[PDB]
Design an enzyme around this catalytic site. Structure first.
Site, short mmCIF file in Angstrom:
data_model
loop_
_atom_site.label_atom_id
_atom_site.label_comp_id
_atom_site.label_asym_id
_atom_site.label_seq_id
_atom_site.Cartn_x
_atom_site.Cartn_y
_atom_site.Cartn_z
N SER A 1 0.75 -1.27 0.00
CA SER A 1 0.00 0.00 0.00
C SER A 1 0.77 1.31 0.00
O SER A 1 0.19 2.39 -0.14
CB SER A 1 -1.05 0.00 1.10
OG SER A 1 -2.07 -0.94 0.79
N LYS B 1 -0.09 3.84 -2.72
CA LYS B 1 -1.28 4.70 -2.70
C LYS B 1 -0.99 6.19 -2.67
O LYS B 1 -1.75 7.00 -3.22
CB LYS B 1 -2.25 4.26 -1.60
CG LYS B 1 -2.97 2.96 -1.97
CD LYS B 1 -3.57 2.25 -0.78
CE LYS B 1 -4.14 0.91 -1.20
NZ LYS B 1 -4.51 0.07 -0.05
N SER C 1 -6.10 3.69 3.87
CA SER C 1 -5.48 2.69 2.99
C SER C 1 -6.59 1.86 2.29
O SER C 1 -6.48 0.65 2.16
CB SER C 1 -4.56 1.77 3.81
OG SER C 1 -3.67 1.05 2.98
N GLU D 1 -5.37 -4.08 -6.84
CA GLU D 1 -5.68 -4.60 -5.51
C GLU D 1 -6.66 -5.75 -5.76
O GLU D 1 -7.55 -5.63 -6.62
CB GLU D 1 -6.37 -3.54 -4.64
CG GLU D 1 -5.47 -2.42 -4.17
CD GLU D 1 -4.49 -2.84 -3.10
OE1 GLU D 1 -4.38 -4.06 -2.82
OE2 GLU D 1 -3.82 -1.95 -2.53
N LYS E 1 2.49 6.74 5.21
CA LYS E 1 1.66 5.74 4.53
C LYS E 1 2.24 4.36 4.87
O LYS E 1 3.44 4.13 4.74
CB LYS E 1 1.69 5.93 3.01
CG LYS E 1 0.82 4.92 2.24
CD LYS E 1 -0.66 5.23 2.39
CE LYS E 1 -1.53 4.02 2.11
NZ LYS E 1 -1.51 3.03 3.23
N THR E 2 1.37 3.46 5.30
CA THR E 2 1.76 2.10 5.67
C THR E 2 1.44 1.12 4.55
O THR E 2 0.75 1.46 3.58
CB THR E 2 1.03 1.64 6.97
OG1 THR E 2 -0.39 1.78 6.81
CG2 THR E 2 1.46 2.49 8.19
N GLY E 3 1.96 -0.09 4.69
CA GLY E 3 1.73 -1.15 3.72
C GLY E 3 1.92 -2.48 4.42
O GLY E 3 2.84 -2.63 5.21
N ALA E 4 1.02 -3.42 4.18
CA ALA E 4 1.09 -4.75 4.78
C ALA E 4 0.48 -5.73 3.79
O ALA E 4 -0.56 -5.45 3.20
CB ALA E 4 0.33 -4.78 6.09
#
Length: 266
Positions: A43, A46, A107, A143, A211-214
């Site tokens: 993510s 984004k 997100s 996605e 901004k995070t991502g997992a």
């Protein structure tokens, strides 16, 4: 030297691959650990898709004001629609501005897919970063497939160095015009997903836009810009990945890496 030593220590303990790149614009000091290795981006992209809409699609708020009506199909196929899935939103639709915003702050998978659609697909993101001089970062899928995160996969990846440079150009540089830059920054500052990650590791008086991502394979990323009280901003990125598909992500590793950076920089 000692920064990187503390980081390799966090890596050894967690059993995860750790990638870090941070740059203090005040002192000029940088911290690099596996900064040029590829990691699944997830993510963290984004921020880029939203920025692309701003620079390339919107002229004077004209495009941002367009209302987009989507379907239950769009919500379901995205496998993640915290805001877009709300009945009222699904019922009335959301404007391009709202969709660009929630892609970052919550997100939202569905909001990002809708923006990729307006852009022309995932490749439009690659073309966008390439226009900014970033030759590493790439988005290839939609996605939720882009989070597959297989160790041998080259698609949908970036490096800690690449993403820190790109994020820096967007937020602190001149990649966007002043108005667009201010919009993008406001969305990053309004993020709600970093509670157990960067926000848990940085001092509470430091302002943070991130901004995070997992994804799969225990991937857990965090990229942003932070402003210590009375000092110049620091751009930092932490990417982490494991080798087992169903491995649990390590929020503590990300928060701990941030702690090392807060004690080293600013």
């Amino acid at each position: 030297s000692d920064a990187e030593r503390r980081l390799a220590g966090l890596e050894r303990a967690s059993g995860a691959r750790l990638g870090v790149y941070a740059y203090d614009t005040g002192s000029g000091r940088t911290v690099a650990y596996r900064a040029d290795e590829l990691f699944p981006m997830c993510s963290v992209f984004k921020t880029l898709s939203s920025a692309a809409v701003l620079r390339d699609l919107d002229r004077n708020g004209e495009f941002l004001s367009r209302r987009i009506l989507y379907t239950q199909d769009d919500v379901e196929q995205a496998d993640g629609a915290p805001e877009t899935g709300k009945p009222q939103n699904l019922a009335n639709g959301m404007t391009v501005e709202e969709l660009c915003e929630v892609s970052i702050t919550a997100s939202d998978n569905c909001a990002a897919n809708l923006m990729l659609r307006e852009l022309g697909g995932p490749a439009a993101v690659t073309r966008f970063v390439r226009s900014l001089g970033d030759r590493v970062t790439r988005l290839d899928r939609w996605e939720p497939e882009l989070n597959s995160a297989e160790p041998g996969r080259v698609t949908d990846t970036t490096s800690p160095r690449a993403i820190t440079r790109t994020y820096g150009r967007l937020v602190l540089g001149d990649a966007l015009n002043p108005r667009d830059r201010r919009l993008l920054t406001s969305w990053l500052l309004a993020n709600t997903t970093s509670g157990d990650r960067f926000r848990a590791g940085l001092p509470d008086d430091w302002t943070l836009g991130d901004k995070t991502g997992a994804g799969r394979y225990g991937t857990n990323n965090d990229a942003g810009v932070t402003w210590p009280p009375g000092r110049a901003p620091i751009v930092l990125t932490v990417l982490t990945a494991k080798t087992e598909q169903d491995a649990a992500r390590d929020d503590g590793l990300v928060a701990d890496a941030a702690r090392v950076l807060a004690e080293t920089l600013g």
